[PDB]
């Protein structure tokens, strides 16, 4: 129907741009971060589930101030059989973060982005998110 490469190119573009917006917002405009998530989105944060945009808003306000350094991004178009009639992209991130009052740490994060067509540009939002520190048991 459409060439696979089209989906791969779309996935890379959406992910690279989204990741830049996401961690810039996290570090420098935390109150806007929840606008990057779908209303029903969840986050599993070091084994802790947070459900819904309003609960995500609260959780992000409670987290200390952050400085993230992102070193690795990979992404893939998600097969239509898993997300019928819905354009989605898996994004995987590795980096480090310094939270205020805490030692610097390495982390891995993955999330699924979904495309929301609009009168102007298609907007990508997080439908589901997962975050874990490399050294979470310390």
């Amino acid at each position: 129907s459409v060439d696979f490469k089209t989906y791969v190119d779309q996935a890379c573009r959406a992910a690279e741009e989204f990741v830049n917006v996401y961690y810039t917002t996290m570090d420098k405009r935390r109150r806007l971060l929840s606008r990057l998530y779908m209303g029903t989105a969840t986050l599993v944060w070091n084994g802790n589930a947070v459900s819904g945009q309003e609960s995500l808003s609260e959780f992000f306000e409670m987290l200390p101030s952050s400085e993230f350094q992102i070193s690795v991004v990979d992404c893939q178009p998600v097969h239509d059989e898993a997300t019928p009639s819905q354009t989605t992209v898996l994004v995987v991130i590795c980096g480090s973060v310094k939270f205020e009052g805490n030692k610097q740490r390495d982390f891995n994060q993955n999330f699924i982005l979904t495309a929301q067509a609009s009168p102007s540009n298609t907007v990508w939002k997080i439908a589901s998110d997962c975050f874990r520190f490399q050294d979470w048991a310390s």
């Binding site: 696979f4 490469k5 791969v8 190119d9 890379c12 992910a15 690279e16 990741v19 969840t42 599993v44 944060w45 070091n46 084994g47 802790n48 589930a49 409670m62 987290l63 200390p64 101030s65 992102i70 070193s71 690795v72 991004v73 990979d74 992404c75 893939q76 178009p77 998600v78 097969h79 059989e81 898993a82 997300t83 019928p84 898996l90 995987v92 590795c94 939270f99 205020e100 009052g101 805490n102 891995n108 993955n110 699924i112 439908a127 589901s128 998110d129 997962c130 874990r132 520190f133 490399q134 050294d135 979470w136 048991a137 310390s138």
Partner: protein, 184 residues
């Protein structure tokens, strides 16, 4: 300004049913993956599955360097396209080229992060030993993210697989290899 991080926890499965399903999948998958011929995974991957590998931006990881995909660093669309493995044939052929492994399955920390009637997304955190070749007996740490659809049998069929491989830290090695005498 706050400074408390919430308490970190182990595996998140959500429900007992899902814990059973995913833990059985991982048992079965890694019995083949660690067997010495991975072609048995052809029946675990969708015809149209995708796979890719990433490692830390930087070695003892040279066998993973040629196929590592970091779109932050690598900008060219054609090369980006070529490093993504697509179709079960190309996925499993790639996996069978990687070093032979022994994973500590029962120590995996698993997070199920998305679920619908058509989709399960879970990420697996753990370690594996390389069993042969240039880095025999080395301990790697990894994070692997799977998206699976219901399998026509009763199991899972993988449509997306992202593997991240790194060296285990000195702390991870110490914990993984410890076996002290019991003390009161």
């Amino acid at each position: 300004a706050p400074t408390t991080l919430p308490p970190c926890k182990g595996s998140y499965f959500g429900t007992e049913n899902l814990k059973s399903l995913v833990l059985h999948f991982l048992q079965q998958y890694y019995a083949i993956y660690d067997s010495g011929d991975r072609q048995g995974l052809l029946d675990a991957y969708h015809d149209g599955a995708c796979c890719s590998l990433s490692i830390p931006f930087i070695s003892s990881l040279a066998e993973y360097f040629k196929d590592s995909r970091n779109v932050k660093k690598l900008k060219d669309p054609t090369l980006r396209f070529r490093l993504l493995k697509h179709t079960r044939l190309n996925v499993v052929a790639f996996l069978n080229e990687l070093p032979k492994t022994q994973h500590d399955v029962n120590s995996f920390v698993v997070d199920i992060s998305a679920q619908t009637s058509t989709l399960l997304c879970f990420s697996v955190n753990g370690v594996f030993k390389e069993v042969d070749g240039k880095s025999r007996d080395s301990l790697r740490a990894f994070t692997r993210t799977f998206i699976a659809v219901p399998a026509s049998n009763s199991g899972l069929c993988i449509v997306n697989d992202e593997l991240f491989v790194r060296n285990a830290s000195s702390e991870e090695i110490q914990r993984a290899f410890a076996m002290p005498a019991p003390t009161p």
